[PDB]
Amino acid sequence: VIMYAXXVXXXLXXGXEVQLTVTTQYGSKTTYWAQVPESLKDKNAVXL
Amino acid sequence: QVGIGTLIVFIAMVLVAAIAAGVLINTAGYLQSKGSATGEEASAQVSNRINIVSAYGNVXXXXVDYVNLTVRQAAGADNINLXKSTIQWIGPDXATTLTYXXXXXXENFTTXSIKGXXXXVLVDQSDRIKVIMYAXXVXXXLXXGXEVQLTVTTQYGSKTTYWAQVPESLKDKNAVXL
Amino acid sequence: QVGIGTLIVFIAMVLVAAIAAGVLINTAGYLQSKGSA
Amino acid sequence: TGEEASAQVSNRINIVSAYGNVXXXXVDYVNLTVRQAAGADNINLXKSTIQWIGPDXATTLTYXXXXXXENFTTXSIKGXXXXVLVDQSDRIKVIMYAXXVXXXLXXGXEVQLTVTTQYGSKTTYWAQVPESLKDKNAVXL
Amino acid sequence: QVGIGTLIVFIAMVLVAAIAAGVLINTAGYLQSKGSA
Amino acid sequence: QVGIGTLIVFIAMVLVAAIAAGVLINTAGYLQSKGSA
Amino acid sequence: QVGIGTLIVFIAMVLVAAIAAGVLINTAGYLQSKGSA
Ligand SMILES: *[C@@H]1O[C@H](CO)[C@@H](O[C@@H]2O[C@H](C(=O)O)[C@@H](O[C@@H]3O[C@@H](C(=O)O)[C@@H](O)[C@H](OS(=O)(=O)O)[C@H]3O)[C@H](O)[C@H]2O)[C@H](O)[C@H]1O
Ligand SMILES: *[C@@H]1O[C@H](CO)[C@@H](O[C@@H]2O[C@H](C(=O)O)[C@@H](O[C@@H]3O[C@@H](C(=O)O)[C@@H](O)[C@H](OS(=O)(=O)O)[C@H]3O)[C@H](O)[C@H]2O)[C@H](O)[C@H]1O
Ligand SMILES: *[C@@H]1O[C@H](CO)[C@@H](O[C@@H]2O[C@H](C(=O)O)[C@@H](O[C@@H]3O[C@@H](C(=O)O)[C@@H](O)[C@H](OS(=O)(=O)O)[C@H]3O)[C@H](O)[C@H]2O)[C@H](O)[C@H]1O
Ligand SMILES: *[C@@H]1O[C@H](CO)[C@@H](O[C@@H]2O[C@H](C(=O)O)[C@@H](O[C@@H]3O[C@@H](C(=O)O)[C@@H](O)[C@H](OS(=O)(=O)O)[C@H]3O)[C@H](O)[C@H]2O)[C@H](O)[C@H]1O
Ligand SMILES: *[C@@H]1O[C@H](CO)[C@@H](O[C@@H]2O[C@H](C(=O)O)[C@@H](O[C@@H]3O[C@@H](C(=O)O)[C@@H](O)[C@H](OS(=O)(=O)O)[C@H]3O)[C@H](O)[C@H]2O)[C@H](O)[C@H]1O
Question: How far is CA D36 from CA D90, D97, E16, E20, F7, in A?
Answer without folding.
Answer: 8, 24, 24, 22, 21
